[PDB]
Design a protein around this ligand. Structure first.
Ligand SMILES: CC(C)N(CCCNC(=O)Nc1ccc(C(C)(C)C)cc1)C[C@H]1O[C@@H](n2ccc3c(N)ncnc32)[C@H](O)[C@@H]1O
Length: 319
């Protein structure tokens, strides 16, 4: 029946929406996905922006929606034309800006998480931690050297965010529970599709089914240089096993978490000598003012860097 279609700015399969356009949740529907996508594409292509200094808008009239899609598609055609002339294509494979990325990931999520219901009351998945993760990404400089892992990666959004944002040799997510691992497969597909659609590049990444305490993971963890773990509700048993597995990490390796694995007020003495606190610097990271603020209360986060010289110094300090 009735449809709206958006042409990709790089000639990928157009995006096709049914009318009336679905609503996703109380604060998201396809209408606004459509508008937001159009706006984002104008940011990729200043030229497209120039073509469309015309658009507030009526999202419940199909006619009003279709003029918008039409103007956009037509300007797209116009742009593709320009690129046959001496004007060169928009720089091919760049990373998406943050703004675009937040959009894309919203899009991927909504197209992948059909029924946001099979996900338990409490924020045990982190639904709007995008800005938070974005902050982390800003602070923890990463490079083609690093390997990244999100321990208990959920449906994968954080892995996708980092992979989109950084140039690690590889990013990994590992998830035990079956239903989110299922969703992650679609997330993965949706993500690849939308990134092609906007013609934006991403670092290599993999989503996996697995337990991060499983024998196999001991080795991998020791090999990972950047670990993100949202351990807020892990408690005693699991924190310990993790500390265990961290102790084998190379010098420089980083762990970013919600609960600290050492303490910050930690100075090295006779009976704390096998405490992990001896092989790692720990800092409290500044929270975001607009923090999701778990437990109706402002909460911050922790960067641990594997630094053995801390130990070495305590053996130099015995002459
Ligand atoms: C709460 C966390 C741990 N996780 C979902 C979050 C998606 N990714 C995420 O939030 N990353 C992240 C976000 C923010 C931060 C900061 C705090 C900002 C630094 C750090 C990391 C839960 C998933 O972990 C899975 N989990 C728990 C243990 C378990 C297991 N041992 N092996 C496999 N997966 C397992 C569990 O099944 C859930 O699907």
């Amino acid at each position: 029946k009735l449809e709206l279609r958006l042409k990709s700015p790089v000639g990928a399969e157009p995006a096709v929406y049914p009318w009336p356009l679905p609503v996703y949740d109380k604060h998201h529907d396809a209408a606004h996905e459509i508008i937001e996508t159009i706006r984002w594409v104008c940011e990729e292509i200043p030229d497209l922006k120039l073509a469309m200094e015309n658009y507030d808008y009526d999202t419940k009239s199909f006619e009003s929606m279709q003029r918008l899609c039409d103007k956009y598609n037509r300007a797209i055609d116009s742009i593709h034309q320009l690129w046959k002339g001496t004007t060169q294509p928009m720089k091919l494979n760049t990373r998406p800006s943050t703004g675009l990325l937040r959009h894309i990931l919203q899009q991927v999520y909504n197209h992948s998480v059909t029924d946001p219901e099979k996900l338990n009351s409490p924020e045990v998945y982190g639904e709007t931690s995008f800005d938070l993760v974005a902050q982390m990404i800003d602070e923890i400089k990463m490079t083609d050297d690093d390997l990244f892992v999100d321990l208990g990666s959920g449906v994968g959004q954080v892995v996708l965010q980092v992979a989109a944002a950084t140039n690690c040799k590889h990013h990994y997510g590992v998830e035990k529970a079956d239903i989110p691992a299922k969703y992650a497969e679609t997330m993965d597909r949706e993500f690849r599709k939308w990134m092609k659609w906007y013609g934006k590049k991403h670092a290599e990444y993999t989503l996996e089914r697995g337990d991060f305490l499983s024998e196999e993971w001991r080795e991998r963890i020791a090999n990972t240089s950047v670990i993100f773990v949202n351990n807020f509700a892990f408690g005693p048993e699991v924190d310990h096993q993790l500390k265990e597995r961290f102790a084998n990490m190379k010098e420089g390796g980083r762990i970013v978490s919600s609960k600290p694995f050492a303490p910050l007020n930690f100075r090295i003495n006779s009976r704390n000598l096998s405490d992990i606190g001896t092989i790692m610097r720990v800092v409290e990271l500044s929270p975001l003012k607009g923090s999701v603020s778990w437990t109706g209360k402002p909460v911050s986060y922790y960067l641990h860097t594997i630094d053995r010289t801390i130990l070495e110094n305590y053996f130099s300090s015995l002459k």
